[PDB]
Structure 1
Amino acid sequence: DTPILTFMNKLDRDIRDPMELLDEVENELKIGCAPITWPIGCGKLFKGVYHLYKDETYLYQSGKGHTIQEVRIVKGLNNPDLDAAVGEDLAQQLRDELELVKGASNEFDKELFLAGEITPVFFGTALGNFGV
């Protein structure tokens, strides 16, 4: 009955739909998904992750994987600086996906996590040292 944290590695790479990634984790691993962060773009378009519970956006910088990059936050989820820093196009897809996410996922519950029934899912990149 050991608890599981989930880390979605390799956001530097062109990946699958993180929605679909949640299905594969719930369906095939028989365990609930509770997103904590959410990727904004992937591959050449990875811009960072929006934290769902802190409501802010940590901005990914390319190739600082050897040390820890400068923590660069954009506060609001509708902050027009998220549009400026990420492009308003990608910024809306963040907003859209987040809508769908809330209707098909889970709030992180500490009790169910310790019971091994939901996993806190973090999206990141261990190579870029971002999300760790």
Structure 2
Amino acid sequence: DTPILTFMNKLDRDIRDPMELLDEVENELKIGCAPITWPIGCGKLFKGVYHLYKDETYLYQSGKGHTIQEVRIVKGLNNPDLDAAVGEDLAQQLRDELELVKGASNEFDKELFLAGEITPVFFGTALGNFGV
């Protein structure tokens, strides 16, 4: 029952779904999920994730793994610039979709993380360098 952070590879293309996801580790596996960062578009239009304990959006770039694409952080949450660079609908879309995160999962607990029972959950794709 030793710690074990979670990771979601393949953030370059589309995906089945962040909801029922971590949800099978509660029935079969048996471990609570604590999302520290969420999606911002799958596929080519992919736009990375966003940290929850840092309130700041990471912006990924197309094609890049050997030379990590420059890093760009748009802190300001619903702040327009984020919305504009990641698209309105989309930027507050996740906003409403992110709202879904407020309900159906927990926050981040350092002590339950090790005390065996939970797992920190990370999101990102290696082939991208974005999310490592």
The TM-score with structure 2 as length reference comes to: 0.94
Give 1:26 shift: 2.7
Question: Is contact 1:5-1:121 (8 Å) kept?
Answer: yes
Aligned length: 132
Give 1:28 shift: 2.4
Bigger proportion of residues as strand: 1
Structure 1 runs, 4 residues or longer, greater than 4 Å off = none
Give 1:44 shift: 2.0
Give 1:54 shift: 0.2
RMSD: 1.1
Give 1:88 shift: 0.5
Partner SS, residue 61 of structure 2? coil
Question: Is contact 2:44-2:62 (8 Å) kept?
Answer: no
Distance 1:83 1:4, change over 3 A: same
Bigger proportion of residues as helix: 1
Give the Cα–Cα distance (whole angstroms) in 1 for the partners of residues 26 and 123 of structure 2: 16
Give the Cα–Cα distance (whole angstroms) in 1 for the partners of residues 19 and 83 of structure 2: 22
Q: Indicate the residue corresponding to 1:100 in structure 2.
A: 100
Q: Structure 1: 5+ residue runs without aligned partners?
A: none
The TM-score with structure 1 as length reference comes to: 0.94
Q: Indicate the residue corresponding to 2:50 in structure 1.
A: 50
Q: Indicate the residue corresponding to 2:64 in structure 1.
A: 64
Question: Is contact 1:4-1:116 (8 Å) kept?
Answer: no
Give the Cα–Cα distance (whole angstroms) in 1 for the partners of residues 46 and 53 of structure 2: 20
